[PDB]
């Protein structure tokens, strides 16, 4: 519908109706749902919600299906006074029914198309669900492995996390301005607004701090990015920001989201954020907590009653303006009318079963594919990997049958349709035994039968890792390694004299050094969704070639955390020329390298790269271009992912060593040659300076080329004279 | 003498005689020395020195003796061609020749005269051979234990380590305005400016960063204390604040400490680091290294060539004023006076010989009274300790007999002065069978001596450690564990039968639960210096009653790094109601809670605290008076610590759940009662706002009055209405 007749309806709505409108509650406290009807009449009586305040309601959040959606809409439409039509909102994190690699995995990807599918796909059957927005993208920047949220997040570099997040919300969104017309499209939602993932010791919630300039520079790119693509929602953060919690945090949310990122829509608290801020001592009570976060511009209070209780005697006393209330009445139906939901509310689905849609066989190949773009092969010594497809397999360990590979914020996707290790090994390998192992133990009895069944086999491949519980949200683990039992597992089997491959899942960076020392491969398949077992057996006999790389350093121990690639030089670096000299920044019991660093991954292929000649000189404001050449040089077609980093060697502020500024995964047959190019922009050369401003200083930048962020040809460019 | 001779100095100066004196030299590099002449050549060639230089130079730091000085400075004073006599500086961190505890044992004696006793000690000492100047207090807050040097500081509370840098100061100088005169004070130099204890992840010389509001709010505080109470000189850190290398951040050198903190004295830079900030990556040469760090008000150079070789280009240039020179200068010149150096510049030692003054019985009295102020009674099971005089008693372990217990940044103690443990038993115990092993083995044969050693005798004391290089400067570790083979011998002698009391010898804390767990007593003696096994002694034995309480908090283990005591909430706090519960901020493996809180340690004695009555409303800008009333309800004499927290229940920013604000250590009788009285003036109820404005907001705020920061009880007070 027009805008005029929008405005026109905020002009119609009494005060109680407004603030209502501000409010998403469970679809279980509406009338009509179709599950949970038991919960309903306590949870209203709890939350002291009455039927004044569900049927004016805003929003839904985590309907159960189609028909609850449309129950709820229906009962919803015949009570509401002007026909405002409520908005469903869902966890969409990396697939609906059709389970995709957890976000992680799709980091080490380094595949955009990769990530956009996965989103479009999400979007195509969450959509047939009845769901009109997703939780997704999770930009949250992270370098501390012991967060269980880490499984959510692309990983350790911003530039990454930017460019696959906007990938995410072209998936979900396709063309932005037409949501109205492509209902297999739904709206997408940035989280968490800001730098949630520094969350200190690891700790779920727990304190966040940098100064404001780091903020910018590292923790604040991938939001923006998503913001400008033309992400519709953005939801706010747990954590404090420089002692503000986010939720009610004027600056970041005022000044920094709305004012310089220029973001227009939908603000939607955390789940409980608002009442939270309470908890964080920033509020006395309901009515403070109600009167901050409206005035920081949180238009949706989710699963709380700040709002719904607090509001109008706020705005009765003149604590809050009314104006704020109706902005933040109409960016909601505005988002309602991006929707198309004032000419159809079900949105496609009224006359139209789109059933059919959900979980077919060409999107569940989709999510295949994925899971062998995402995964990592860590070790292959002596080429154990590709196993023949005659190869005699005993399969060990706690994830050999074990149908927990969904990954963790799987809320839609259900184990009995994802495909096992067992299983999936067995459609491809004539002989398989099978010993499964209980997650955290390792008996006498499992020892004789891993021995017996190693004894009759030829290789071993030992399926290691965590239960999805152990991360996702409030999934915090203090010492980043599996269960003592799974390294005593790996300890024992290596002694059985047979090659072994380690087949690891799980959401985060481990302690893997142990792991590695103990089998003669090792890959990392994170949690690859609904395919995982065809997924596992395709990399496994190289059906496909293994070419992800590592979005996210793997330290050497817990206490190296946090490491990450782009890590400042400090006045006292370790050198190849000093190293064993006590007065140097290192650690006296470990290496200062993460055990694998950003960038890194093995492939069955050989590649050669080679960098056309670059200028030695640049003019301010100027892009360099960077020529490319690779061929693989083996006999085996594989994928290589192309890095390129930038170093600012002296600067205003102490620059990192390195940061990544354009990459592309490379697909070639035996023998194939391509050529790419890439432009980095005076933006690349470019920071924030001590005063906050984004500045491009003249100087000397090194421009590395290679396969990791340490498999790299070095280049020197002078920067200076005249802005173009 | 008079300051118009001081400005007619700076004034008859050369430019090149300018330049030097802002340049600091070891000892051996001057003519006169009298040790190490054999590194003096190489040493000269390779910093390319002159003899213009060096006797030009402003500073000598680490002489070696009274003899080393007198040396240096009568052949400096035959050829300088004004009479400027160098300033002697060092390193008297923790004892000069008696060496007291380590500062953060001394930071858990809570006892500002211990502190205060310990620098009146050291500087009696170190002026005794010949220094002026020393390179303490130690003033960075830590709350990373992988960090070598919080053996430095006095641990993780800014109010504590306020407090007791005042008293070291204090302790130095005496009254500052008279060190021309006090010739047996010396001036102190407080360090690090600013906040490098922060290291990430525990890194030597690593990246630190917080918000500038943080900064202010934890960090800055014990610097400014000590300033305002009269240090004579500032040293800069290594580490980058916000992303500028401290030595030439302009705006914490010259904006936060000479602007706002009104430091008017020399700023020394850490060793190396004005050429350190090339390494950083924020100057791409010496000269800009120079001309940056002067910008930025360092007015002394340590044993690094960037000012001596770039500053005479850069004035002559005009990319310097030779104003910022002659303002280094003076400040130089004026220390230089206020040390009696232009009447005396042997500071008291010509005619003196003052050998009579180092390590004298009194001194040691001093040292072992300190040492049993500062250990901490962490575990006594079942009344083990004290043991009876005739307690027979098998000591082992790696700490046995080691003489390695004077600690870290101990420059010029001697061990064989030091009282190992065995020395020390046995002045006070008649039967004592000792089996020593090495600190990283447990071998079959230990094994057996002693299993032989502890059949023969009663109970076991069992001395662990570490070795004082596993600390200090450079000595960071990723885990904060002793040897496994420490582990491994506590699980073996807790087999044989016997009561175990460990005694633990070492800089950091480190992981205890299974030592604690293995064993019926545990004292945490941690270096004690020079009378370290009678500290041991007297306490085991109860001619001392432990009296410590822990100053940093001892984490669960590695992986819960960064914890500590003053907190923020979080907006999912685990309660004691929701304990169990997923959705809230815990860890899965481990307890929020460390596994020992600051301001916690036992007594042989049993206290009882009673508060008398408050107020329940107080005016903003009134002081809170504290009265309590302590008593002693054992037969056994003994001291506690009694400790006042306050907290800001709501605020503008999150603020933590507990501050300490007041602290006395109380000595009491067998059945013996006192009353101590604290006032807490509305400073206590301040903090840094997100404009970085010092405020006392109204509200509610709660009162904590025990002993430690759990064992408390609470009080409620209400501030609003009028101000004063
Ligand atoms: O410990 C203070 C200094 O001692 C010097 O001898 C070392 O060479 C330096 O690297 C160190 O910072
Ligand atoms: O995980 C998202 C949310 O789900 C709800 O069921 C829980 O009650 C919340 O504590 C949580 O933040
Ligand atoms: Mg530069
Ligand atoms: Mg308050």
Redesign the pocket.
């Known amino acids: 519908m027009e805008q005029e007749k929008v405005q026109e309806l905020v002009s119609q709505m009494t005060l109680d109706e407004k603030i209502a409108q501000c409010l998403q509650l469970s679809p279980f406290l509406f009338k009509g749902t179709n599950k949970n009807a038991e919960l309903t009449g306590p949870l209203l009586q709890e939350m002291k919600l009455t039927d004044a305040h569900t049927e004016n309601a805003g929003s839904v959040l985590g309907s159960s299906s189609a028909l609850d959606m449309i129950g709820i809409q229906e009962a919803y439409l015949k009570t509401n006074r002007l026909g405002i039509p409520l908005v469903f909102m869902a966890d969409v994190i990396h697939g609906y029914k059709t389970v995709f690699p957890i976000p992680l995995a799709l980091g080490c990807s380094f595949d955009r198309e990769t990530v956009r599918v996965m989103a479009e796909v999400s979007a195509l059957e969450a959509t047939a669900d009845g769901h009109h927005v997703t939780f997704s993208p999770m930009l949250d920047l992270v370098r501390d492995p012991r967060w269980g949220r880490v499984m959510e997040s692309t990983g350790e570099d911003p530039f990454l996390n930017s460019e696959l997040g906007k990938a995410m919300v072209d998936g979900y969104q396709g063309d932005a301005s037409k949501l109205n017309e492509n209902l297999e499209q739904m709206a997408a939602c940035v989280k968490h607004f800001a730098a949630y993932g520094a969350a200190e010791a690891g700790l779920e919630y727990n304190t966040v701090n940098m100064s404001t300039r780091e903020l910018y520079q590292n923790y604040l790119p991938a939001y923006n990015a998503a913001i400008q693509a033309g992400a519709k929602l953005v939801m706010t953060a747990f954590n404090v920001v420089d002692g503000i919690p986010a939720t009610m945090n004027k600056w970041l949310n005022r000044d920094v989201l709305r004012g310089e990122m220029e973001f227009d829509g939908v603000l939607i608290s955390?789940?409980?954020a608002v009442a939270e801020v309470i908890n964080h001592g920033t509020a006395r009570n309901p009515k403070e907590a109600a009167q901050f976060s409206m005035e920081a511009g949180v238009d949706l209070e989710m699963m709380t009653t700040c709002y719904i209780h607090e509001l109008k005697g706020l705005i009765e006393e003149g604590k809050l303006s009314e104006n704020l209330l109706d902005e933040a009445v109409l960016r909601m139906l505005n988002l309602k009318n991006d929707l198309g939901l004032f000419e159809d509310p079900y949105r496609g689905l009224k006359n139209n079963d789109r059933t059919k849609d959900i979980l077919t066989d060409e999107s569940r190949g989709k999510a295949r594919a994925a899971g062998v773009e995402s995964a990592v092969l860590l070790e292959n010594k002596s080429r154990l990997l590709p196993l023949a497809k005659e190869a005699k397999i005993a399969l060990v360990g706690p994830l050999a049958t074990s149908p927990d590979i969904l990954g963790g914020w799987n809320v839609y996707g259900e184990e009995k349709d994802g495909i096992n290790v067992e299983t999936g090994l067995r459609e491809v390998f004539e002989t398989v035994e099978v010993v499964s192992t209980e997650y955290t133990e390792l008996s006498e009895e499992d020892k004789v039968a891993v021995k017996a069944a190693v004894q009759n086999m030829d290789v071993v491949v030992l399926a290691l890792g965590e239960k999805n519980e152990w991360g996702g949200?409030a999934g915090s683990l203090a010492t980043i390694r599996l269960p003592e039992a799974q390294y005593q597992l790996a300890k024992f089997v290596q002694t059985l004299g047979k090659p072994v491959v380690i087949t690891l899942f799980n959401g985060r960076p481990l302690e893997v050094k142990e792991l590695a020392e103990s089998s003669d491969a090792l890959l990392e398949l994170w949690f690859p969704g609904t395919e995982a077992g065809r997924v596992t057996a395709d990399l496994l006999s190289g059906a496909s070639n293994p070419s992800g790389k590592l979005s996210m350093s793997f330290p050497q121990t817990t206490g190296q955390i946090p490491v990450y690639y782009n890590h400042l030089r400090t006045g006292r670096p370790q050198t190849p020329e000093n190293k064993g000299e006590r007065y140097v920044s290192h650690y006296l019991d470990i290496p200062n390298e993460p055990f694998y660093p950003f960038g890194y991954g093995k492939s069955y292929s050989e590649f050669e790269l080679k960098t056309s000649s670059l200028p030695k000189e640049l003019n301010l404001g100027e892009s360099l271009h960077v020529e490319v050449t690779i061929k693989n040089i083996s006999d085996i077609a594989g994928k290589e992912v192309i890095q390129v980093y930038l170093q600012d060697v002296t600067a205003s502020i102490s620059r990192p060593v390195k940061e990544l500024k354009a990459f592309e995964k490379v697909a070639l047959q035996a023998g194939e040659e391509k050529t790419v190019t890439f432009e980095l922009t005076s933006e690349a050369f470019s920071f924030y300076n001590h005063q906050l401003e984004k500045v491009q200083e003249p100087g000397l930048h090194r421009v590395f080329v290679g396969t990791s962020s340490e498999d790299v040809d070095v280049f020197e460019v002078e920067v200076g004279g005249y802005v173009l």
Chains 1, 2 share one sequence.
Do not use: L, M, S
């Open positions: 955390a789940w409980g949200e």
